[PDB]
Design brief:
- It is found in: Cytoplasm.
- The protein is mainly alpha-helical.
- The protein is 63% helix and 0% strand.
- α2 crosses α3.
């Protein structure tokens, strides 16, 4: 895991990853909408059988 860590965990800090997600989701500066879109997506798409 040290590998994966070294390639991405070194480049991406915290909470910015969410930005990269809502990023790919919504192309066009929406700060609010980007973050809330990504947040919406994590909860409503990722293993929704878990919550």
């Amino acid at each position: 895991l040290f590998d994966n860590l070294e390639d991405a965990s070194d480049i991406s800090t915290q909470e910015e990853a969410l930005d990269y997600i809502g990023r790919l989701a919504l192309p066009g500066q929406p700060k609010e909408y980007r973050l809330r879109r990504a947040e919406h997506i994590i909860d409503n798409n990722l293993l929704p059988h878990m919550g």
